[PDB]
Design a binder for this molecule. Sequence first.
Ligand SMILES: [Mg+2]
Ligand SMILES: [Mg+2]
Ligand SMILES: [Mg+2]
Ligand SMILES: [Mg+2]
Ligand SMILES: [Mg+2]
Ligand SMILES: [Mg+2]
Ligand SMILES: [Mg+2]
Ligand SMILES: [Mg+2]
Ligand SMILES: [Mg+2]
Ligand SMILES: [Mg+2]
Ligand SMILES: [Mg+2]
Ligand SMILES: [Mg+2]
Ligand SMILES: [Mg+2]
Ligand SMILES: [Mg+2]
Ligand SMILES: [Mg+2]
Ligand SMILES: [Mg+2]
Ligand SMILES: [Mg+2]
Ligand SMILES: [Mg+2]
Ligand SMILES: [Mg+2]
Ligand SMILES: [Mg+2]
Ligand SMILES: [Mg+2]
Ligand SMILES: [Mg+2]
Ligand SMILES: [Mg+2]
Ligand SMILES: [Mg+2]
Ligand SMILES: [Mg+2]
Ligand SMILES: [Mg+2]
Ligand SMILES: [Zn+2]
Lengths: 51, 149, 101, 82, 88
Amino acid sequence: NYVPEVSALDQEIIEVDPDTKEMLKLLDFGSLSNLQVTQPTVGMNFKTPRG
Amino acid sequence: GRMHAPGKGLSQSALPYRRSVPTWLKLTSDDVKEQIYKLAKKGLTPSQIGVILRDSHGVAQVRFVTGNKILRILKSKGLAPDLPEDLYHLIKKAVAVRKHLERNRKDKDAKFRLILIESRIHRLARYYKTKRVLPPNWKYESSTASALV
Amino acid sequence: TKKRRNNGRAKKGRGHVQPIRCTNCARCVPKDKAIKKFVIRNIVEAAAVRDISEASVFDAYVLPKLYVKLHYCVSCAIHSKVVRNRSREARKDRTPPPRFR
Amino acid sequence: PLAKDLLHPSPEEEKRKHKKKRLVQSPNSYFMDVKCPGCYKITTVFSHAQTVVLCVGCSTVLCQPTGGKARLTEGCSFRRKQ
Amino acid sequence: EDVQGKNCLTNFHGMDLTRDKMCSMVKKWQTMIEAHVDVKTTDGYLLRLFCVGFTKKRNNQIRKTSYAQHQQVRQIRKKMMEIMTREV
RNA sequence: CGCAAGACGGACCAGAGCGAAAGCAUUUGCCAAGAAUGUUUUCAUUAAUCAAGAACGAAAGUCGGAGGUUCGAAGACGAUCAGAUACCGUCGUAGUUCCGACCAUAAACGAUGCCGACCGGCGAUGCGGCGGCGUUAUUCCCAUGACCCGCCGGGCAGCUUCCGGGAAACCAAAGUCUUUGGGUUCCGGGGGGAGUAUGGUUGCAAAGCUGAAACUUAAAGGAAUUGACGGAAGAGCGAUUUUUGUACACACCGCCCGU
Ligand SMILES: [Mg+2]
Ligand SMILES: [Mg+2]
Ligand SMILES: [Mg+2]
Ligand SMILES: [Mg+2]
Ligand SMILES: [Mg+2]
Ligand SMILES: [Mg+2]
Ligand SMILES: [Mg+2]
Ligand SMILES: [Mg+2]
Ligand SMILES: [Mg+2]
Ligand SMILES: [Mg+2]
Ligand SMILES: [Mg+2]
Ligand SMILES: [Mg+2]
Ligand SMILES: [Mg+2]
Ligand SMILES: [Mg+2]
Ligand SMILES: [Mg+2]
Ligand SMILES: [Mg+2]
Ligand SMILES: [Mg+2]
Ligand SMILES: [Mg+2]
Ligand SMILES: [Mg+2]
Ligand SMILES: [Mg+2]
Ligand SMILES: [Mg+2]
Ligand SMILES: [Mg+2]
Ligand SMILES: [Mg+2]
Ligand SMILES: [Mg+2]
Ligand SMILES: [Mg+2]
Ligand SMILES: [Mg+2]
Ligand SMILES: [Zn+2]
């Protein structure tokens, strides 16, 4: 039952995507100060090259 | 599916629910009828007239504006062809295939397609005889076909 | 009793496929059914590589490769052991054997 | 699955279906007002036109037909109707 | 072409590629386009030129094959023929 | 190093495309035809399946012309063998190639008629259209090609599922069948005799289509299981629970075909 002194979930800044921010806003949680919006990846290439 | 092909396509037109002429259209029924008469005198089939009216003059559906179809307007005016346009096109295609086939005796596919086209011609001719659009003696003969169209 | 769903060939949506000749026995076998093998090897073998690299007049002269396309009928493929029988469940697996180490 | 309101599809559901497979048929086409820079006349053009549309006043090619839609000539502006 | 006292003098007669180069150029999931022309030089030499090209896979491409449609192949072949004609 | 003839279009070539099916692959041009997609065009029931009757129809085969490279039925030889009149090797005639007339048969197979409706997911792929960040080429600009992410419609298929079927093998059709009726064409009635005899009809011929009876027999046959052989490497109705094939089960010393 090892317990750290501080929580690993505690972060002064948490990075979110704009879509996550919109989802939070729809649930009237857009006022959080810990959130930081990061620029999404420009290129949409997430699939393994078929071959 | 197709009458003479295995294909089962679904491509066609979908008319809107509303039958009312749109507000922006400034044309009257008489002006549309005059345009139809001028296009017919120029020598255009009703299908081409409808295409031109749709593309250029913003006339989506003449039956919605004038209350009548193109062929009925032509018949009332008297500028209507003796035989229907679709039968005319079928006979013209049969004539073209037969003219090609006489110079190419070994083209069996042309013979097969000519048989199919003539079957469609016979179907349409029988239908038009039933409706008395054609006299009950009109016959499609290969020799006469060139003079017919 | 059908043994395979594809009838042991790769014909789909067509009627006829031109036949080829078995490299081993010269039998006529349809091209889609035949067992194909692309062989890329060295002209000189392992010992010949070291024996030739010293007698060459060039520096770091690359030895040419041999490219061959081989076609086999079912009997010759099975007899030569390039193809083996598999279990009823293992027949369906059409992944190429893991030659890449 | 096992629970879907067929009477009230969402607006995005009905724009994703085939035009004939909707609850009520509706075309995907429209009419537009087009203006060329040379000449001031406004011409009504169907989106899926099949003929070359020429400006009556000044004989300018407004659009060229293609497989799906008609492409407007460079420098021509258009606005949808209604 | 001529002998000048223990000196054979040669002239251009042809050009070709090695067997392994051609065998390694041809691969299975792409399109090959070939063309040939008959062109006469200004000094009377008549030549027959052959050209071959292969379609290239894109850097970020996920599709296994790289096939050109028939009209694209015809355009490419015509572009080959005109360039080979205008350079001889 | 050249010349000549004839036949075939390798690799690219894929569970990819086209065609009613047979079938279809060097470049270019001409000729006619076609599916799919797009459509706020036109006609307005014109449609589906089909006795009679027609067009096409691999290979082989037949009759006239032209060519005959390769291969090669028949045939002559050399081997092998107890014996080979076979398999193997050397030659080699019709044929294999083109034109004009016949022939209408294939395991001509998806061993699965066509038209229409409904009933689960997933990822690709070919054609057309629609939308959208971003990389590349047309020196600039749109725009058009090559990629990338999606949507829709036809098409060839694949994986998965206690949708439901079925004797099972398996099948998203071979489902929506004792809770049995959407339309329609062909077609089967234990195993042999036998697709034989005869009559008719078509063909130059070979043969094609239609097509019995007397008589004989208690089984023949399908799918799957456990064994035995081989000159091979909780779940199922239920039997039942190294791979593989089997027409064997008195289990290869088996079974079985024709003189
Ligand atoms: Mg029909
Ligand atoms: Mg259409
Ligand atoms: Mg076949
Ligand atoms: Mg195989
Ligand atoms: Mg097809
Ligand atoms: Mg080639
Ligand atoms: Mg009949
Ligand atoms: Mg033949
Ligand atoms: Mg023959
Ligand atoms: Mg002869
Ligand atoms: Mg022999
Ligand atoms: Mg020989
Ligand atoms: Mg038969
Ligand atoms: Mg088959
Ligand atoms: Mg059958
Ligand atoms: Mg698809
Ligand atoms: Mg396609
Ligand atoms: Mg596309
Ligand atoms: Mg029943
Ligand atoms: Mg019986
Ligand atoms: Mg009996
Ligand atoms: Mg138990
Ligand atoms: Mg049980
Ligand atoms: Mg066996
Ligand atoms: Mg078996
Ligand atoms: Mg057994
Ligand atoms: Zn072989």
